């Protein structure tokens, strides 16, 4: 096997219309985790 | 001499470290002169010599330590 | 009424760490009172040597441990 890389190693397919919402939602939830973390310690208070 | 032995058994740790270093150096000098003897094998033989000398000097020291008059 | 007198410049240990001094003064005072007598003057100054610098709060637990005899000292 002698394949030529297409200069594309993104771990997941990317394109304009649809995947943008998925990427932005993942970014938002991984940004906002600390929020639920800080809310958990002050739940029963 | 009744005084040399007092210092010989007073400080067992420093003299034992010195004789261990002497044995290590002498064994390294003697062993590292042959052809059919690689460096790890000669080091192992030197360390075995050191272990034997350490055991015998340990038995000698624990034998002479009873003289605590 | 009052004078400025306490533990002097301890020549045994001049460094910052002087934790062993309290225990040394305690055991030395106990050895001193065990021998000699009781009303003798000199070790009354040794009595001050483990109260001025010691917290005196560990002294209560020291008394509790020593009263039952479990105190681990030669004297």
């Amino acid at each position: 096997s002698a394949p030529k890389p297409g200069s594309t190693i993104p771990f997941y397919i990317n394109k304009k219309p649809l995947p943008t919402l998925l990427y932005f939602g993942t970014f938002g939830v991984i940004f906002s985790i600390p929020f639920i973390v800080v809310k958990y310690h002050n739940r029963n208070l | 001499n009744q005084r040399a032995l007092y210092y010989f058994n007073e400080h067992k740790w420093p003299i034992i470290l010195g004789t261990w270093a002497s044995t290590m150096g002498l064994s390294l000098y003697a062993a590292s002169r042959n052809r059919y003897d690689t460096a790890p094998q000669k080091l192992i033989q030197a360390r075995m010599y050191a272990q034997g000398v350490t055991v015998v000097v340990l038995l000698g020291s624990v034998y002479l330590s009873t003289l605590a008059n | 009424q009052f004078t400025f007198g306490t533990v002097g410049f301890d020549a045994r240990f001049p460094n910052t760490n002087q934790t062993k001094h309290c225990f040394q003064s305690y055991i030395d005072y106990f050895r001193c009172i065990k021998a000699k007598g009781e009303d003798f003057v000199p070790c009354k100054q040794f009595w001050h040597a483990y109260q001025s610098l010691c917290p005196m709060e560990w002294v209560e637990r020291w008394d509790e441990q020593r009263e039952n005899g479990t105190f681990p000292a030669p004297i």
Binding site: S7, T8, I9, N14 | - | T16
Partner: protein, 537 residues
């Protein structure tokens, strides 16, 4: 069915190239969480008094401890020390793959469970409260009751042993897989640095393993290892911890040294001044950065002679680093400079910040001087202005410099430069006022402060906000680069000299580079170096 191919190419794959990308991604997902933690803690101290919270001091302790631990052990070490080494070291040594592929595959996957268990531990009823440097009595079952800090201890243990296991194969790879005719002396500076960090980390971390395990056993087996009534001395714990902590920052920052020494010449088109002197001074730094450990115990109350012995030697560290900075300054002058390039921008901005941070570090290396700054905001300013200005800048420069080799795409120069400027300004106005806050004589790790400190905290908060926009812009530029299909040539950083014809250069000059990695196509082959490159013996 590409699903089997998908998971064989990603999960059941041991190629070095397919792993460093995951290293970068894991570093990124740790760094975002850490940056948000830092933002929340800095927003807490915007104004005096309980703010956005019900005065929860334990929550603030959890936040600071989590930020510190996750950003020191999940952001910079795994995404810089081995991320840019496992991918690149085989390229510069002349080998097709690392010595032990299976251990290389194994080391990466010990980290995700560590992150999950650390998050679970922080999600307990109390959470870790000892800070980045947890201390035995505070960690004692007396204060914390639950599985909060034990899991943090376990995470530190397993991350350390994984990093040690992730550095055993590298040394063998760069000591035995050398190219024919490539003497160890003639090795490039970057791999020299990375090997020095590997050997230092492997030599030191076992001590942490043993000390951390024996300290943790106090909570379960009720050992008297560090109990004040049990005969244990916590100063022993401090000595054990700071026999590791002091060289850790150096082994973290040496890859930044190597990446700067690599970025400067290629974008300056001038060979590095005094390679042998620089590498020997760096070796002197590596050997020197072990016998000095008690500068973190200046106000504990040790003896005079020990304090003098371990404070006098703190100064001698500066001399080789100053020599390195002077050598880089000499290299910059004379040769051509393309100051508009983003890697050049980061390399230039690294030097001034690193040297001012080093000056701050040499400020407080004296027992006579540390008493006025020990455990105050001044040490916070020093160590932050060194860490986040050197290691973060080196990581950003390395990413922006070797990204086409990792993937084969081009980023947006305008947005990257804007991000660099915004981040530089924000981080300069974040740690600036803290110098004055610590110079006034006000301690660190305090959610509340006396009223006469509000102004500098207010000045720091705006920069803390600005850093978040910098992060957002970096995320946008990364996404754009990933989905812009902008092609890249073999050696994008090679340009014709002043006397190269436009037809002679294109046909009789291509395929030449100062380093091996630029000789191959930007998306590198799975099996490179079919035959060993042979130099002049």
């Amino acid at each position: 069915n590409s699903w089997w191919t998908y998971v064989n190419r990603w999960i059941f794959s041991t190629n070095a190239k397919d792993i460093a990308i995951l290293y970068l991604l894991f570093g990124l997902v740790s760094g975002i969480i850490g940056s948000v933690f830092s933002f929340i803690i800095r927003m807490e101290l915007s104004a005096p008094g309980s703010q956005f919270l019900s005065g929860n001091g334990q929550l603030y302790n959890v936040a600071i401890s989590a930020h510190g631990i996750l950003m020191i052990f999940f952001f910079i070490i795994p995404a810089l020390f081995g991320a840019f080494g496992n991918y690149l070291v085989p390229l510069m040594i002349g080998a097709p793959d690392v010595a032990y592929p299976r251990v290389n595959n194994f080391t990466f996957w010990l980290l995700p469970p560590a992150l999950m268990l650390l998050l679970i531990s922080a999600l307990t009823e109390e959470g870790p409260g000892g800070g980045w440097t947890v201390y035995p009595p505070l960690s004692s079952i007396t204060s914390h009751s639950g599985p909060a800090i034990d899991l943090a201890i376990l995470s530190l243990q397993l991350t350390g042993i994984s990093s040690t296991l992730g550095s055993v194969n590298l040394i063998a790879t760069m000591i035995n897989m050398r190219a024919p005719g490539l003497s160890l002396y003639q090795m490039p500076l970057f791999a020299w640095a990375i090997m020095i960090t590997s050997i230092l980390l492997l030599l030191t971390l076992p001590v942490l393993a043993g000390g951390l395990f024996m300290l943790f056993s106090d909570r379960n087996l009720n050992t008297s290892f560090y109990a004040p009534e049990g005969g244990g001395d916590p100063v022993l714990y401090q000595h054990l911890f700071w026999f590791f902590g002091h060289p850790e920052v150096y082994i973290l920052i040496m890859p930044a040294f190597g990446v700067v020494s690599h970025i400067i010449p290629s974008l300056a088109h001038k060979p590095i001044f005094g390679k042998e002197g620089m590498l020997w001074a760096m070796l002197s730094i590596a050997l020197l950065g072990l016998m000095v450990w008690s500068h973190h115990l200046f106000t504990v109350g040790l003896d005079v002679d020990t304090r003098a012995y371990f404070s006098a030697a703190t100064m001698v560290i500066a001399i080789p680093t100053g020599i390195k900075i002077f050598s880089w300054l000499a290299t910059l002058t004379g040769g051509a400079i393309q100051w508009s390039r983003v890697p050049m921008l980061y390399a230039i901005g690294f030097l001034i910040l690193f040297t001012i941070g080093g000056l701050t570090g040499v400020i407080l290396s004296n027992s006579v001087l540390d008493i006025a700054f020990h455990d105050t905001y001044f040490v916070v300013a020093h160590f932050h202005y060194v860490l986040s200005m050197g290691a973060l800048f080196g990581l950003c420069g390395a990413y922006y410099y070797w990204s086409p080799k990792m993937f084969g795409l081009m980023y947006n120069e305008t947005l990257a430069s804007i991000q660099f400027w915004i981040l530089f300004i924000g981080v300069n106005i974040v740690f600036g006022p803290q110098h004055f806050l610590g110079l006034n004589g006000m301690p660190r790790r305090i959610p509340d402060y006396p009223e006469a400190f509000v102004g500098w905290n207010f000045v720091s908060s705006i920069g803390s906000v600005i850093s978040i926009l910098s992060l957002f812009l970096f995320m946008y530029v990364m996404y754009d680069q990933f989905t812009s299909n902008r092609v890249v040539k073999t050696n994008p950083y090679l340009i014709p000299s002043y006397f190269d014809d436009n037809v002679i250069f294109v046909n009789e000059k291509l395929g030449v580079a100062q380093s091996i990695e630029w000789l191959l196509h930007s998306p590198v082959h799975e099996h490179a170096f079919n035959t060993l490159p042979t130099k002049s013996i």
